[PDB]
């Protein structure tokens, strides 16, 4: 934060893009009531999986959005969840790296 240049700015931008990452509608997935800890104190069953995979619930699979934005547990759909105009093949909802 003391000495900054064009190379330093490029390195900071690359580090930020590596660490943190026309409609671009962000699906504001709200805390689902069907969980396991402070949810319904129940184990993982077919009901919770079907509610998180078909309905808009970010329990296990993920809360699907409009415009065919199917966000399942391992669905790498080409959506536009980012803040840019690139609707490329985004990673899965889990994105386990």
Based on the shown chain and the rule CB under 8 A, indicate whether residue 21 belongs to the binding site for another protein.
yes
Q: Which is nearer to another protein, 38 or 68 (CB)?
A: 38
Neighbours of 80 (CB within 10 A): 19
> Residue 65 carries which DSSP code?
-
Structure tokens at 83: 């803040």
Q: Which is nearer to another protein, 8 or 68 (CB)?
A: 8
Based on the shown chain and the rule CB under 8 A, indicate whether residue 2 belongs to the binding site for another protein.
yes
Q: How far is the CB of 75 from another protein (least distance, A)?
A: 13
40: left (phi over 0), alpha (psi -120 to 50) or beta: alpha
Residue bearing tokens 């949810």:
39
| Size of residue set near another protein by CB under 8 A | 43
Within 13 A of 89's CA, how many CA atoms are on the CB side? 3
Closest CA to 59 of 83, 82, 43: 43
Based on the shown chain and the rule CB under 8 A, indicate whether residue 23 belongs to the binding site for another protein.
no
Based on the shown chain and the rule CB under 8 A, indicate whether residue 6 belongs to the binding site for another protein.
yes
Chain residues in the site for another protein (CB under 8 A): 1-2, 4, 6, 8-10, 12-13, 15-17, 19-21, 26-29, 31-32, 35-39, 43-44, 58-60, 62-63, 71, 81-84, 93-97
């Amino acid at each position: 934060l003391s000495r900054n240049e064009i190379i330093q700015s490029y390195l900071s931008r690359q580090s930020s893009l590596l660490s943190s990452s026309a409609r671009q509608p962000h699906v504001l997935l709200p805390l689902p009531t069907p969980t396991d800890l402070p949810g319904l104190t129940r184990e993982v069953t077919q009901d919770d999986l079907d509610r998180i995979q078909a309905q808009q619930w970010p329990g296990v699979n993920g809360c699907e959005d409009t415009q065919g934005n199917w966000y399942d547990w391992t669905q790498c759909i080409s959506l536009d969840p980012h803040g840019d105009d690139g609707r490329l093949n985004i990673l899965p909802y889990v994105c386990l790296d």
